[PDB]
Amino acid sequence: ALQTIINARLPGEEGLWQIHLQDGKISAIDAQSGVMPITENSLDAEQGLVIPPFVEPHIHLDTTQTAGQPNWNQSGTLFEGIERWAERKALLTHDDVKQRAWQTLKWQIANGIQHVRTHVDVSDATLTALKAMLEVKQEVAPWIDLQIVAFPQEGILSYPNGEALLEEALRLGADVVGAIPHFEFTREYGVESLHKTFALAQKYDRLIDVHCDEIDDEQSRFVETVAALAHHEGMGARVTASHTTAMHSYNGAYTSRLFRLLKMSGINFVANPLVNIHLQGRFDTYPKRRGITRVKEMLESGINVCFGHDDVFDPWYPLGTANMLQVLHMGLHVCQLMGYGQINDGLNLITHHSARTLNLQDYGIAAGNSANLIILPAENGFDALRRQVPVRYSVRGGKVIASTQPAQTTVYLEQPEAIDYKR
Amino acid sequence: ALQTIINARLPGEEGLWQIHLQDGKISAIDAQSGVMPITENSLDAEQGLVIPPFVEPHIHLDTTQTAGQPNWNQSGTLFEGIERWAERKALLTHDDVKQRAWQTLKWQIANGIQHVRTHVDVSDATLTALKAMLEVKQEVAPWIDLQIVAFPQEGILSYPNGEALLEEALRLGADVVGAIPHFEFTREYGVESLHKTFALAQKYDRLIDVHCDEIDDEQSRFVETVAALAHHEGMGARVTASHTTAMHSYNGAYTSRLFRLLKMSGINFVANPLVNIHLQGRFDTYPKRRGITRVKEMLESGINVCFGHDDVFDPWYPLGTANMLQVLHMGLHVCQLMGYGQINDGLNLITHHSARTLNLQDYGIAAGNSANLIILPAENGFDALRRQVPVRYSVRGGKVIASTQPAQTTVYLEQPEAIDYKR
Numbered sequence A, B: 001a002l003q004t005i006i007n008a009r010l011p012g013e014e015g016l017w018q019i020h021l022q023d024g025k026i027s028a029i030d031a032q033s034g035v036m037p038i039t040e041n042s043l044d045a046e047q048g049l050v051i052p053p054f055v056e057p058h059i060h061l062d063t064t065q066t067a068g069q070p071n072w073n074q075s076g077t078l079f080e081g082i083e084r085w086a087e088r089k090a091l092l093t094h095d096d097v098k099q100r101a102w103q104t105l106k107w108q109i110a111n112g113i114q115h116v117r118t119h120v121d122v123s124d125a126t127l128t129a130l131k132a133m134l135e136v137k138q139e140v141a142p143w144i145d146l147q148i149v150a151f152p153q154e155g156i157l158s159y160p161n162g163e164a165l166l167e168e169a170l171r172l173g174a175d176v177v178g179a180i181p182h183f184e185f186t187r188e189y190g191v192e193s194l195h196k197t198f199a200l201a202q203k204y205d206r207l208i209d210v211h212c213d214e215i216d217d218e219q220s221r222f223v224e225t226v227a228a229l230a231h232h233e234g235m236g237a238r239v240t241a242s243h244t245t246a247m248h249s250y251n252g253a254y255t256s257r258l259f260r261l262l263k264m265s266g267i268n269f270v271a272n273p274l275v276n277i278h279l280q281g282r283f284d285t286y287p288k289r290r291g292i293t294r295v296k297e298m299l300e301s302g303i304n305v306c307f308g309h310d311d312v313f314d315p316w317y318p319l320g321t322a323n324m325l326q327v328l329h330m331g332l333h334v335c336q337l338m339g340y341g342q343i344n345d346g347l348n349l350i351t352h353h354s355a356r357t358l359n360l361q362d363y364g365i366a367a368g369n370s371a372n373l374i375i376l377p378a379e380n381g382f383d384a385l386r387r388q389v390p391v392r393y394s395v396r397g398g399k400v401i402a403s404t405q406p407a408q409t410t411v412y413l414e415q416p417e418a419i420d421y422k423r
């Protein structure tokens, strides 16, 4: 029966703050002039940072926890990954998908993630994973708001009954329409697939999230069609272009021309640093390109960009604990957003920007919003990132749904000394 | 008064093992056929992984904890970094250096690091940091064996009295001779500086560790002189080429020719992933090169290569907690050593390979060696890396010098559930 969050630090704000809770919502936020005493019904943030929940804007829960089954992706490429997944997709069962999705979802709850957008492969006449994921969505609702993207992994026009299956997925309840233009047989199929994707999103009033130009091909420019169609339909807010790794390889003049449209369109962008650094640059010898989209430039231009984990122990990525601060750490390094302020502001890439990408309507520490927030045992975004701190408490609807008792390290010198890695 | 380490897993070995300790050394190692019972004087590894101590083969303890003083490195380049450091170097004091070096050394002890090689800038007539570091070396000896590299940061031939100061540093006790050929005014000064570096190492019987070709210049090939001189003097084991980031930009034909010499010479290589990904590629627009040396190819050719953290919160790197598993994580991603076996074998890059780089004579879990070892709460190298586990216990001379009580995470679902991120 929590009534208040006290001694809280807030990004971009000076001092400590008190967050009053009432009926599962935030009733008011007031600044404090000093440290407040703890008491019953008060959750002490202990001068730690309080922020809305971490968000996972791009993950594949249907493939999670399947790395090496039946075989391993030896080349470390997107293309072999799809082929290795195809082998596993043929062996899927309802319970298998639910068990694995839930295992990763629990790690996400433990990591303060209360909003997740999972893509689900719908290039499968049986739609096995989709049916399973729709049940998981209902089951996990008390802890995570899960969005499902109908993702035509093998193409819309390049796979038998691809468009029909994509629409069937929407009729069954998928929240977002997906696409993968660079994987279609031809550039023309790629462009046409986007017109079909947008028509379905308008027909069913759904969001859009395209696996867009995930390839080191300077000629892969499907992103301009995604942005142009969004601008034409006046629906930028509901549209997302995931990856756009090809943008890392575009010449600067085209990119500058393109950026005007990206900003005017208002669409969202997702970069997946852990997976992008691994799968991109695989066709170069030396030097080897990084392959992440132009994150730094998007931020400088006011274009909404955010980070996703993409994969957790599957054909496209053998690692992960579904930790967003870890995803952010990799992104800041590869994108060279290493200035103090850029690092400190990094939290935006895994909180607010991701919420906008998911078109969330109830997100942020503000009066009237649901009492969904997490507490990090750190002074600010920089500190949280540097020390890769766990989530001390995760609060949803005004109730604690996860907590982590921090590790305790001691070094035995002339006398025992506690080490917290702070300066 | 520990007498045994029980229930230990060892890299590359099947089953559990018992490590008997006697007089501060490992007396014997025996395989177990099942789980052994705990008892007084027995340290239970609890089926966790036991390995010799982590090693930090390349760090700058004289500059650590000084990021932003007096100003920040705004460009994120090696060159501005040196210039920003120059401003701080002018404000150094004995106690200042000792305090900061010790702060980072404590984090290293907490992180199971018992061997550290620190470079110390000796392009300073007062040799302030060097005098301070020599005292720190004596002070920290019970927990860490610290090697000091006399590092002529501003060049040997390109800085006033550079060679004289370098030799003075050796006469005062520095363990390793350093150099920085790519920073010298001319290619000729670069080559000549290496002849002088080798002559000093032979005159004083010291090791060598060159900041070698840390620049995105395909024409920076000082590494061939380092390797050739080592081969000529028959001293490969005592020589290290740090960085060699220029190798990331060499054409393949020259690299192939060069590799024959690298292998024949027997010299060591250090890659610094966290810093290299940040400082390299800064002169590219898009695409942007990764800039780490050819780690994967060195491993395939049997060339000894290892990883260092390089910097901890200073002019060249604003982050860090001096954690080697974190350094390894970045290196595996950027170097694309992402196959299951490559990741699992990754521990070698921060243990055995680094010990060879430091020319250590008492290292490894073997009968007769000092009882210096650490325990990771993980099943193998892959698991330790994936979950970024802390060091449960660090043992030196048969005594516990550091321990970490792991964090405890719980998610409150229909019932409370402990989350350990394992599969």
Ligand SMILES: O=C1NC=C[C@H](O)N1
Residues within 6 Å of the ligand: A060, A078, A180, A211, A214, A310, A311, A316
């Ligand atoms: O096409 C893809 N499928 C799964 C992961 C990666 O994001 N790309």
Ligand SMILES: O=C1NC=C[C@H](O)N1
Residues within 6 Å of the ligand: B060, B078, B180, B211, B214, B310, B311, B316
């Ligand atoms: O020349 C250098 N000084 C400090 C760090 C970096 O390793 N390079």
Ligand SMILES: [Fe+3]
Residues within 6 Å of the ligand: A058, A059, A060, A119, A211, A310
């Ligand atoms: Fe994806």
Ligand SMILES: [Fe+3]
Residues within 6 Å of the ligand: B058, B059, B060, B119, B211, B310
């Ligand atoms: Fe260095």
